[PDB]
Amino acid sequence: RQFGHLTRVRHVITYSLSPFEQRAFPHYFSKGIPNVLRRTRACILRVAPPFVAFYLVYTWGTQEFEKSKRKNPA
Amino acid sequence: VAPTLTARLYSLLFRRTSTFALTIVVGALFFERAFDQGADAIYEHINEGKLWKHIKHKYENK
Amino acid sequence: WLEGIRKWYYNAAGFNKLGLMRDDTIHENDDVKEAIRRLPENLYDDRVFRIKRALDLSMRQQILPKEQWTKYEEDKSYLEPYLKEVIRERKEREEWAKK
Amino acid sequence: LMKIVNNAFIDLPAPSNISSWWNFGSLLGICLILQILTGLFLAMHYTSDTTTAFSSVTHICRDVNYGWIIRYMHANGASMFFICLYMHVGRGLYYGSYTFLETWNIGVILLLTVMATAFMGYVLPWGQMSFWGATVITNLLSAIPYIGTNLVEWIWGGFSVDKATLTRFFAFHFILPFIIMAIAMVHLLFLHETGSNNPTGISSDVDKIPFHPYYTIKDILGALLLILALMLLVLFAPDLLGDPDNYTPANPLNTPPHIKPEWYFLFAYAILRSIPNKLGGVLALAFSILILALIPLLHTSKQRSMMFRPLSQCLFWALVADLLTLTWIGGQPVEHPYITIGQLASVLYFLLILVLMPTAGTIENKLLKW
Amino acid sequence: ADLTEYLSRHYKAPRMVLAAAGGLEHRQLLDLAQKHFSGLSGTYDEDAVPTLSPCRFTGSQICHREDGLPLAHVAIAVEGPGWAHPDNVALQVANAIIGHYDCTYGGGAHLSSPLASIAATNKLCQSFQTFNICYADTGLLGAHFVCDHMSIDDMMFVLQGQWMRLCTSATESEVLRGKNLLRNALVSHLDGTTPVCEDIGRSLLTYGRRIPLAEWESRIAEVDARVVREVCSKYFYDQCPAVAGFGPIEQLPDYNRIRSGMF
Amino acid sequence: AEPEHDHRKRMGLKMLLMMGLLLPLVYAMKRHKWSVLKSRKLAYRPPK
Ligand code: HEM
Ligand code: HEM
Ligand SMILES: C/C=C(C)/C=C/C=C/[C@H](OC)[C@@H](C)[C@@H](OC)[C@@H](C)CCc1oc2c(O)c(OC)cc(OC)c2c(=O)c1C
Ligand SMILES: CCCCCCO[C@@H]1O[C@H](CO)[C@@H](O)[C@H](O)[C@H]1O
């Protein structure tokens, strides 16, 4: 696969600036943080629930194990 | 009628590749000595009195 | 629910946030590659641009302004007629292959 | 020297949008080269005689100049290798990269080969985990009907793990990494035929960028963070990921009471341990890895990547959380309630991959009307 | 209204040059000028006098991908010095060394220009031309080429290679060839009343005077390998170029690669 | 059990200081190169 034989593209214009003409960290924080917050909010319902479940099973199981080893008066 | 620091560094050290190469070289030598001594000083200060070099005098004269 | 849940799923899927149409996201097997080759120039050129735009947004980890998201009610299959025929032709050839 | 060095790297067309998850391939290559270099330097001082093996390792760490750093880099390098391996495989599953069948299947062979290599390397110091690890793992072959026992003794070169075993494990550990390197090159040759997949799973032929400078610089940065993670372990917590028991020479008359596998083997260990049947456990262990070869056949979605598939993502993350659960269980004693959590987690693993994910794929297709 | 506004504002006597070349005497032209152009306005308000502000040059790239076209056109340039600058002579000598070329040239493989030579023997392009477009205080110094979609990268590679070669190693013999070409270009161009007349009109507007061939010769004669290396280095070496591409340009190198090719 | 204890921590300090320098530098180099793609703009102009 090489440039010149990839695929057929028509009527698309691309505009670019030399890296020496631009900032490497444009709005790093002003726009960066908001985007990271958008992206975080966009996935948390998909990523977090399973790990919270693990966290629950872990604390329950660990505690259940500890309880089971002690005081069994009879 | 005055160039900024970087513009000055560019013209003298960064434009030519041979000079850019010699700047990194001497740069590396001066950097190594100063970095190592500074880093060590921080280490020895954080650990003042604990290292062998710090208590060594109490036993030397051998 | 289905249509209610469908529009919800469509937006949750989110390819519309990149300005893509559902058919722009189909996995390209050989039937699909042939269907694409058969698309009229304008449909082909449109698909190419929507994919280029989406890849560019993905690269910047960005999405389009909400007003430009593909809308669930407007997304239609431009590929279906071509792909259906390509699949029917292949099925026909397979029937003959069994002698 | 031009081409294949070129049109093969510099002008290699790469998707413009591959994220950080695509850095793990080059990081695996770097882990492989690090392991090979440190390993070779260790091989220069290690002796495989059971009477000197443990001692030669302590000599490396104590008297060989910088031997300790080379030794701990090799040890923690193996852990970094696995972290990268699992991320790499995870990326492939989430993005549907496994549709590159040849590349993916060679990948599965690489995974099994690295596991075998790390296992054998771990036996070399001849500490307690080395010895019992060698006993248990080779004994997996004893589950094979009628000849399993014969196979095991053949591998051992005797009726028990002894001198003959250690010496051949050093030779196998030595050569396998080079075999892995050659297989990794084939893994790459197969990938270049199609080029890389990308987060959207959509063909990126309309937006390719040269590999250099974009990914060469992105790879260097990734490499620096790999080195950072590795050296933090080596210089600040060299034993964190290791087992104290291996600092005790092998004792064939005694298996430590809390013996446990290397952390990267804990999930598979949890699975095997969940089945109160010998053959059953070994078959499930084998299948926990070999199931990767079935993923391509279980793909029901009309879309390649999970990026646009919310239901699949939920299941994918449940799978990751489940492996985390299995990893935790594997580190716990076989006692209530861990036995049941491990069995449930083991069932969930296979359920997610074999039923839930394919089902989700079909449900999403319906929702999208195709 | 827009047009009359434009005309009233720019067509002022102080912004015009009445030039002539041929069998005529200056006094006669002046006579005719006094008679016919005296009424021409020599003023236009206080805020009327149009004045040119400097035009910033931006290292950048514009790519109009059109795979339907048979050949790709690429134009690349670095910022030039501007009409009035003395550097233009050494730059014209440099451009003459790289030259121009098209598939109908008879020299082929034997052409003196390495680029033309390589282009011809390897069939890398249909044509190419270096150029030095000058404006008041800036300009475009570079080249344009037309080639097959699979040759863009090779053309760019050799073209940039040649710019770098001139910056670091122009040789006296090739600079002498450049000077001779430029000498022949200058004189053969000023052949006929129209070319001379235009040279007069334009020179008065740009330099403010007609630069005599004797002066051009002196400026050219001053150019040597050293001057070519220094002047080319000043405008090409490690400078950001402006790049324009049109047609089947999938193989046009990425801007970063082009930029790296400048050093 | 760990005679290299003090030496590894001294090296650890140097490693952190070096990464503290090299990571932001390489990262700036990455952003520098990628800025050409990050700010590129696209226009679709089909004849119609
Ligand atoms: C994929 C490549 C490799 C992996 C994953 C790997 C992994 C390991 C592991 C897990 C250990 C145990 C380390 C410990 O805890 O002490 C080990 C030990 C060892 N390996 Fe490797 N290794 C690799 C390549 C090599 C190569 C190429 C050589 C030799 C040419 C080598 C030589 C050694 C030696 C001599 C030891 C014993 C010393 C020690 O224990 O540190 N290894 N290896
Ligand atoms: C020694 C181990 C391995 C090495 C050195 C290795 C190396 C690489 C490299 C350099 C890439 C290209 C860049 C990337 O996409 O990350 C790659 C891609 C890939 N690898 Fe591996 N790999 C290893 C193991 C595996 C394993 C365990 C699997 C899966 C079981 C695998 C599956 C893939 C796939 C499917 C791709 C294409 C990814 C895509 O384009 O989306 N690899 N590998
Ligand atoms: C001559 C070469 C030979 C025979 C190599 C064969 C290699 C086989 C596999 O690799 C392909 C194997 C390493 C891989 O199985 C898929 C692992 C996940 C096995 C995980 C594993 O580890 C343990 C371990 O490390 C221990 O140490 C202290 C102790 C152990 O129980 C007490 C175990 C254990 O119960 C299991 C299942
Ligand atoms: C990056 C965080 C790693 C998790 C820390 C615990 O790590 C674990 O510690 C055990 C002893 O406590 C070891 O036996 C085990 O091999 C190791 O993986």
The finding on whether D261 has its CB within 6 A of some atom of ligand 1 is no
Tell if the CB–CB gap between C62 and A35 is shorter than 8 Å. Answer: yes
Q: Apex CA C53: angle with CA F45 and CA D307, to 5°?
A: 155
State the distance from the centre of ligand 2 to the C-alpha of D74, rounded, in angstroms. 22
Torsion of CA D30, D31, D36, D41, to 10 degrees: 100
Helix (H) or strand (E) segment spanning residue E178:
helix E172-189
- CA-CA distance, E234 to E90, in Å (whole number)? 11
Query: Which chain A residues are Cβ-neighbours of D318 within 8 angstroms?
Result: 50, 53
Evaluate the omega torsion of the peptide bond into residue A34 and state whether it is cis, within 30 degrees of 0. no
Sign for the CA dihedral angle at E27, E30, E32, E34 comes to negative
Residue C55 and residue D208: Cα distance in Å, rounded?
A: 10
Check the CA dihedral E2-E5-E9-E13 and report its sign. positive
CATH of the domain at B36: 1.20.5.260
CA atoms of A3 and A26, how far apart (whole Å) = 30
Distance from CA of D13 to the nearest CA of E (A): 10
Domain containing residue B9: 1-62
CATH class label, A1-74: mainly alpha
Domain span at D235: 1-370
End-to-end Cα separation, chain D, in angstroms: 50
CB pairs under 8 A between A and E: 62
Q: Are strands E60-66 and A10-17 parallel, antiparallel or unpaired?
A: antiparallel
Tokens 């290299």 sit at which residue? F4
Measured CA to CA, the distance from residue B31 to residue B23 in angstroms comes to: 11
For residue C1 the two structure tokens come to 């629910």
Tell me how far the alpha carbon of residue A31 lies from the centroid of ligand 4, in angstroms.
Answer: 39
Number of inter-chain CB pairs under 8 A, D vs F: 50
Q: Provide the token pair at D292.
A: 């990767």
DSSP at D127: B
Q: CB neighbours of D12 closer than 8 A, spacing ≥ 6?
A: D192, D210, D211, D212
Tell me which residue of F38, F23, F22, E256 sits closest to A26, measured CA to CA.
Answer: F38
As for how many domains chain F has, the answer is: 1
D265 lines ligand 3 (CB under 6 A): yes
Sign of the four-CA dihedral E138, E143, E145, E151: negative
CATH number at residue E230: 3.30.830.10
8 A C-beta contact, residue E42 and residue E13:
yes
- Report the alpha-carbon distance of residue E87 to residue D246 in Å, rounded: 75
Residue type, E216: W
For residue D337, say if its preceding peptide bond is cis, omega within 30 degrees of 0: yes
Q: How many domains does chain C have?
A: 1
CATH (domain of C5): 1.10.1090.10
Method: X-ray
3-state secondary structure of C43: helix
Q: How far is CA E21 from the centre of its chain?
A: 24
> Which ligand does the CA of D136 lie closest to?
3
What are the chain B neighbours of E237 within 8 Å (beta carbons)? 15
* Contact (Cβ atoms closer than 8 angstroms) between residue D54 and residue D250: yes
Which residues have C-beta within 8 Å of that of residue D163, sequence separation ≥ 6?
A: D49, D50
Q: Give E76's strand partners.
A: E143, E243
The structural domains of chain A, with segments of one domain joined by +, span 1-74
> Looking at the complex, does the CB of residue A17 fall below 8 Å from at least one CB of chain C?
no
Task: Tell me which residue range forms the domain holding F48.
Answer: 4-48
DSSP output for D289-304: HHGGGGGGGG---SSS
With CB atoms and an 8 Å threshold, state whether A8 touches C48. Answer: yes
The enclosing H or E element of C89 equals helix C80-97
Residues of D labelled as active-site residues:
192, 196, 218-219, 262
Q: How far apart are CA E147 and CA E101, in angstroms?
A: 12
CATH of the domain at D210: 1.20.810.10
Ligand lying closest to the C-alpha of residue D283: 3
The CA-based angle E77-E80-E85, given to 5 degrees, is 160
The SS3 of residue E136 is coil
Cα separation, D108 vs D102, in Å, equals 10
Structure tokens at C91: 């099925």
- Closest alpha carbon to E229 in E142, E183, E171, E181: E171
- Write out the residue range of the structural domain in which residue C56 sits: 1-99
Alpha-carbon Rg for chain C, nearest whole angstrom, is 16
CA distance linking residue D135 with residue D141, whole number of Å: 11
Residue B57 CA to its chain's centroid (Å): 28
Q: What tokens were used for D21?
A: 């998850």
Number of H helices, E strands in chain E: 10, 6
Residue D199 makes CB contacts below 8 A (sequence gap 6+) with: C58, D17, D18, D19, D21, D95, D305, D307
- Total structural domains in chain B? 1
Q: Does A12 contact F31 at a Cβ distance shorter than 8 Å?
A: no
Please count the other Cβ atoms lying within 10 Å of the Cβ belonging to residue D172. 16
* Mutation target vs F (from D231, D232, D239, D240; most F CBs, 10 A cutoff): D231
E residues 205-234 closer than 8 Å to B (CB): none
